[PDB]
């Protein structure tokens, strides 16, 4: 039931990582939808698998971020081209539409100020529990230094309660030698989000937005 | 050499090869007489390691030993006296079955000294062994300053006095703490000396 590029059974060794670039059989860019099957990791409890995987080479996820600024968010962030707004987009982000070819849940990762948290689950929350894109308080959302990294592939991922995962982490159109230092350091940053981990899962999964799921030891 | 290999190969006894080679070797060594001369050692690597050589005359015998704990031979009619002594059917010898093998050889062949033995096969009513003997008057063993020591008189019948390898087992001799009682030499000579009343001349 497996394809030619997305290896299912074969626990491939350390020298066959170079074929991870061969998932680009399409021409349009695809978002790598990561997934894994977790044993003894219940997401209904307080273990909410949400973090940030800061990786050295940026595969550029197409991420728009609205930055709520009150004299602390956009003062230093001109080195990374912040939007420079005074948190007035939240007045129109819910209960109405902005313009043509635009939704009201219009981001991938939201970063919020510290002093205007009260309106995030109350007027914005009913538009986000219906969206699932809710900004947490631990997804590197402070904009003291966390804006140079935000366009530098800051992936905020929320958890599904049906034990499936699909979140954009990047693309596979580039060479796997760039992914030789990327996948070797991301999986060290994914297991830090796990608890009491030595080996609770037998094998890993990775998958693009138009490709079959690869698996690798 | 080969001898290290057949060492390691005899060890894997529960396997499929060595469970047949000991299955055939039982229903060869059961249709014969309980005391019986084999020409050659069965296991020639554990004929080595135990003091056998291939010169005339190192003699070998196969014995069968009836295998189980010792029923006190009491006349149907009681071990009389106190209930502490009333036990008949769970008594176990202080001697082995291997030592009981070497005995029934060495009793019977009065003019050949015993060196060791080894297990060769067993089945369920008869554990059975392979004893190494040495004539001590053949010249090829009297000339031999590596094997010559068993020719002395102080080894006459050297396991009816407990002194082979599988005789020294059942005594209990060793060192130190765990083998403390008995450290007088043997085992009975400890209670002689523990109990010794020293009636010194100058009290």
């Amino acid at each position: 039931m497996a394809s030619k590029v997305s290896r299912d059974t074969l626990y491939e060794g350390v020298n066959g990582l170079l074929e991870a670039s061969a998932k680009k059989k399409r021409g349009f860019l695809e978002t790598v939808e990561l997934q894994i099957g977790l044993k003894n990791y219940d997401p209904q409890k307080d273990k909410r698998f949400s973090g940030t995987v800061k990786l050295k080479h940026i595969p550029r996820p197409k991420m728009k971020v609205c930055i709520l600024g009150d004299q602390q968010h956009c003062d230093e962030a001109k080195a990374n081209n912040v939007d420079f707004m005074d948190a007035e987009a939240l007045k129109k982000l819910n209960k109405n539409k902005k313009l043509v070819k635009k939704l009201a849940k219009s981001y991938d990762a939201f970063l919020a100020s510290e002093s205007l948290i009260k309106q995030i689950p109350r007027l914005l929350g009913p538009g986000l529990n219906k969206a699932g894109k809710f900004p947490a308080l631990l997804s590197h959302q402070e904009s003291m230094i966390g804006k140079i990294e935000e366009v530098k592939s800051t992936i905020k991922f929320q958890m599904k309660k049906v034990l499936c995962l699909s979140v954009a982490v990047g693309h596979v159109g580039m060479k796997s030698d760039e992914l030789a230092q990327n996948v070797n350091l991301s999986i060290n940053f994914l297991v830090s989000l796990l608890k009491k981990n030595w080996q609770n899962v037998r094998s890993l999964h990775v998958k693009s937005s138009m490709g079959p799921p690869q698996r690798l030891y | 050499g080969a001898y290290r290999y057949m060492q390691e190969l005899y060890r894997k006894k529960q396997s499929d090869v060595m469970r047949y080679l000991l299955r055939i070797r039982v229903w060869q060594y059961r249709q014969l007489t309980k005391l019986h001369r084999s020409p050659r050692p069965t296991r020639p690597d554990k004929a080595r390691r135990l003091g056998y050589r291939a010169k005339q005359g190192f003699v070998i015998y196969r014995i069968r030993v009836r295998r189980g704990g010792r029923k006190r031979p009491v006349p149907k009619g009681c071990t009389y006296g106190k209930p502490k002594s009333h036990g008949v059917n769970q008594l176990k010898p202080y001697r082995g079955l291997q030592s009981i093998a070497e005995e029934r050889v060495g009793r019977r062949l009065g003019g050949l000294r015993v060196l060791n033995s080894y297990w060769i096969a067993q089945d369920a009513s008869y554990k059975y062994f392979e004893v190494i003997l040495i004539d001590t008057h053949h010249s090829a063993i009297r000339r031999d300053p590596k094997i010559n020591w068993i020719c002395k008189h102080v080894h006459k019948h050297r396991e009816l006095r407990g002194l082979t390898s599988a005789g020294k087992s059942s005594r209990g001799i060793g060192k130190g703490y765990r083998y403390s009682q008995t450290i007088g030499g043997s085992r009975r000579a400890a209670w002689k000396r523990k109990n010794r009343e020293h009636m010194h001349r100058k009290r």
Binding site: - | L9, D16, V17, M18
Partner: protein, 56 residues
């Protein structure tokens, strides 16, 4: 010479089938909690010694 039937019946417990009960079986057989510990690593090794060498 091949395997042994307490190991050949605990390799089958060790394919997927809860190698705690493998350890509770070797310590029942071998039986000492380091001999059972040091036997479980061997049959873990052999089951992954057939991982591709015994494809064909």
């Amino acid at each position: 010479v091949g395997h042994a039937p307490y190991e050949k019946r605990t390799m089958e417990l060790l394919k997927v089938s809860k190698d705690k009960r493998a350890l509770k079986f070797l310590k029942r057989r071998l039986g000492t909690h380091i001999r059972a510990k040091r036997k479980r690593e061997e049959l873990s090794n052999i089951l992954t010694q057939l991982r591709k060498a015994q494809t064909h």
